[PDB]
């Protein structure tokens, strides 16, 4: 509350460390469905169904330009990528399985780097 604060957690390396995680997600062999924005002209249904599209290249641009206020807003966009994927793709598809694998990979790196 006013003039009463928990001890200051060091967040000075968060930007660098989120960039490193994002590099590792970018270079994963199952990243290919997620590298670029879904083409809304060429994929029927995507525009109407997926209210907030997100992809790794869009996260990279947001990260690089100071559009994440803190490390939690960064994790929310990464998770959005996988939540969108599960909304649109059957679990038993190459893309569906890719999304599950990447979400697992992410959540381990996240816990190990920050928890």
């Amino acid at each position: 509350s006013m003039s009463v604060k928990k001890p200051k957690r060091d967040d000075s390396k968060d930007l660098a460390l989120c960039s490193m995680i994002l590099t590792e997600m970018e270079t994963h062999e199952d990243a290919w469905p997620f590298l670029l924005p879904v083409n809304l002209k060429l994929v029927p249904g995507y525009k109407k169904v997926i209210k907030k599209p997100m992809d790794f290249s869009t996260i990279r641009e947001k990260l690089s330009s100071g559009q994440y206020p803190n490390l939690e807003t960064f994790a929310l966009d990464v998770r959005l990528v996988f939540d969108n994927c599960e909304t649109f793709n059957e679990d038993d598809s190459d893309i569906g399985r890719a999304g599950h694998n990447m979400r697992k990979y992410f959540e381990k790196k996240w816990t190990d780097t920050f928890k």
Side-chain angles (χ1 to χ4, degrees), residues 1-7 9-12 14-114:
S1 73
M2 197 183 329
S3 314
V4 181
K5 287 305 165 327
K6 295 200 184 57
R9 187 210 164 244
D10 185 11
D11 66 345
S12 64
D14 290 359
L15 184 61
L17 285 157
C18 292
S19 179
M20 284 174 63
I21 293 165
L22 181 55
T23 298
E24 295 163 358
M25 276 193 309
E26 287 166 335
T27 59
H28 193 296
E29 75 163 281
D30 303 339
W32 58 264
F34 313 115
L35 295 177
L36 299 178
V38 174
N39 185 334
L40 299 181
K41 302 169 192 295
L42 303 185
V43 176
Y46 208 84
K47 195 169 199 299
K48 187 64 182 271
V49 171
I50 300 292
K51 300 308 184 182
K52 292 172 70 172
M54 187 51 60
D55 69 286
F56 295 166
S57 79
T58 301
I59 301 174
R60 171 72 72 192
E61 184 64 37
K62 287 180 66 168
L63 193 62
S64 291
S65 63
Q67 294 186 64
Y68 293 116
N70 57 56
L71 85 166
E72 302 303 334
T73 57
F74 168 82
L76 282 171
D77 265 356
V78 176
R79 290 168 182 144
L80 175 63
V81 172
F82 310 124
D83 294 345
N84 287 346
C85 181
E86 279 195 51
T87 293
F88 211 78
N89 293 269
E90 273 292 341
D91 296 345
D92 189 10
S93 62
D94 293 278
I95 289 169
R97 282 187 280 283
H100 288 293
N101 290 351
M102 294 301 304
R103 179 196 301 273
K104 190 88 179 171
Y105 190 70
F106 170 67
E107 287 308 344
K108 170 95 154 68
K109 303 278 185 187
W110 191 252
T111 293
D112 293 354
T113 304
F114 295 118

